[PDB]
Design a protein around this ligand. Structure first.
Ligand SMILES: *N[C@@H](CCCCNC(=O)CC[C@@H](C)[C@H]1CC[C@H]2[C@@H]3CC[C@@H]4CC(=O)CC[C@]4(C)[C@H]3CC[C@]12C)C(=O)O
Ligand SMILES: *N[C@@H](CCCCNC(=O)CC[C@@H](C)[C@H]1CC[C@H]2[C@@H]3CC[C@@H]4CC(=O)CC[C@]4(C)[C@H]3CC[C@]12C)C(=O)O
Ligand SMILES: *N[C@@H](CCCCNC(=O)CC[C@@H](C)[C@H]1CC[C@H]2[C@@H]3CC[C@@H]4CC(=O)CC[C@]4(C)[C@H]3CC[C@]12C)C(=O)O
Ligand SMILES: *N[C@@H](CCCCNC(=O)CC[C@@H](C)[C@H]1CC[C@H]2[C@@H]3CC[C@@H]4CC(=O)CC[C@]4(C)[C@H]3CC[C@]12C)C(=O)O
Ligand SMILES: *N[C@@H](CCCCNC(=O)CC[C@@H](C)[C@H]1CC[C@H]2[C@@H]3CC[C@@H]4CC(=O)CC[C@]4(C)[C@H]3CC[C@]12C)C(=O)O
Ligand SMILES: *N[C@@H](CCCCNC(=O)CC[C@@H](C)[C@H]1CC[C@H]2[C@@H]3CC[C@@H]4CC(=O)CC[C@]4(C)[C@H]3CC[C@]12C)C(=O)O
Ligand SMILES: Cc1cccc(O)c1
Ligand SMILES: Cc1cccc(O)c1
Ligand SMILES: Cc1cccc(O)c1
Ligand SMILES: Cc1cccc(O)c1
Ligand SMILES: Cc1cccc(O)c1
Ligand SMILES: Cc1cccc(O)c1
Ligand SMILES: [Cl-]
Ligand SMILES: [Cl-]
Ligand SMILES: [Zn+2]
Ligand SMILES: [Zn+2]
Lengths: 28, 21, 28, 21, 21, 28, 28, 28, 28, 21, 21, 21
């Protein structure tokens, strides 16, 4: 599960930038 | 979901846009 | 707006850790 | 919202839990 | 340069593309 | 100079994502 | 390719700190 | 206090890289 | 050793948030 | 130590509190 | 401490080495 | 390049200095 935890951290940082003003809904 | 989709195989920024509100 | 952009990056990283398996809904 | 709430004055981790799904 | 351009006023992702190789 | 240092850290993370395979040239 | 993407994110953050005022040229 | 919180996040990332195998003691 | 380096970066960011005002002692 | 403990198997935020000063 | 020292004025990587164990 | 060099085996900060401008 550690690899998925590390990956998720990067996913949320990318969504923040990609989505801008829209924001996003993160669920694993 | 996104972890299954994007943590084994790589996702494009275009694919990530699906999760934007 | 730059300060808010920088702050938002940190907010999303904190929500990722705090919320765990639940995930979260980010909107500025 | 969260930027107004947490980017001028500091938010506790407890306050951030409100935004969890 | 980029610090002068993007650290006082905000830059779009489109503006940042100028610095790609 | 601290604010510029903090901002630069975020600029380089954004360039990494935006530029993809092309990479980028960072100079302050 | 995911592992390389995650690694690259950390490489660019390290180059930012190591290189200081010089900046750096990132290409995968 | 928000600015100090954001700064601290970057301080700890820098200490991680600078200190390597030695590790470090962070206290605000 | 690369995987451990990447993991450590995330460990220190989590300790920063979890420990708050107390700070923490990081040693690999 | 923490790398051995938390980099192969996942650690809870509760486990990480042990390393707080 | 380090926040007072390094969050208003900038610290060099050399200064940060003081906090290494 | 740097991904081949530094993403399977670990790179020192000294090695990373090669990529500074
Ligand atoms: N984010 C995504 C996906 C989220 C999907 C919503 N969550 C679930 O459906 C919950 C599933 C949990 C309860 C199981 C997933 C993995 C399981 C573990 C796997 C290893 C062992 C297997 C075993 O025999 C029992 C123990 C073990 C630890 C499992 C426990 C149960 C799980 C955690 C979205 O939003 O769509
Ligand atoms: N995330 C939070 C809050 C999100 C709230 C939803 N968004 C809006 O309500 C959109 C408001 C926008 C259109 C305006 C906010 C700030 C404005 C600018 C401020 C500076 C000048 C002012 C001026 O006279 C016109 C130009 C200017 C740039 C403004 C443009 C319009 C705004 C961007 C949640 O989800 O609740
Ligand atoms: N990344 C961008 C911009 C990089 C531009 C290339 N660098 C320079 O041109 C170097 C300029 C330096 C030497 C000066 C900039 C700011 C100066 C300081 C400002 C505060 C005081 C002012 C004073 O009276 C003397 C001391 C002081 C500390 C200054 C020292 C000299 C500077 C650091 C790109 O690539 O284009
Ligand atoms: N950053 C470094 C290195 C960058 C080197 C410059 N880029 C290239 O030389 C481009 C090479 C690409 C086109 C290929 C590399 C890996 C290939 C894939 C590997 C898996 C399969 C293999 C296959 O049979 C075809 C499909 C596949 C997806 C390959 C496609 C082509 C590649 C992406 C520097 O700057 O020096
Ligand atoms: N990390 C560094 C420094 C850590 C120093 C150890 N901590 C303390 O000494 C605790 C001091 C606290 C209790 C106070 C610092 C700032 C105060 C607040 C400032 C704004 C107002 C002022 C006021 O009139 C009362 C309320 C207010 C919120 C203050 C509360 C008390 C403080 C938080 C190291 O390790 O050396
Ligand atoms: N942070 C944790 C743990 C820190 C523990 C304190 N450090 C040590 O005890 C130092 C141990 C070092 C010297 C060795 C650990 C791994 C070794 C390498 C493994 C691969 C090969 C094995 C070999 O045959 C010789 C070369 C090789 C590279 C080893 C070199 C020696 C090590 C680096 C805490 O604080 O508790
Ligand atoms: C951009 C990004 C981050 C993490 C995983 C991915 O597949 C893609
Ligand atoms: C944890 C956190 C991050 C960013 C802003 C805050 O107020 C709090
Ligand atoms: C995306 C980004 C990061 C830092 C500063 C900016 O203006 C924009
Ligand atoms: C929170 C966290 C970060 C890195 C590794 C872990 O096991 C847990
Ligand atoms: C390297 C670094 C991070 C944060 C503040 C500083 O003064 C220096
Ligand atoms: C400092 C660093 C980051 C990523 C990979 C490495 O080998 C080294
Ligand atoms: Cl990682
Ligand atoms: Cl910041
Ligand atoms: Zn990572
Ligand atoms: Zn920051």
């Amino acid at each position: 599960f550690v690899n998925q935890h590390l990956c998720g951290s990067h996913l949320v940082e990318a969504l923040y930038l990609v989505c801008g003003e829209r924001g996003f809904f993160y669920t694993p | 979901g996104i972890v299954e989709q994007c943590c084994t195989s790589i996702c494009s920024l275009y694919q990530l846009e699906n999760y934007c509100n």
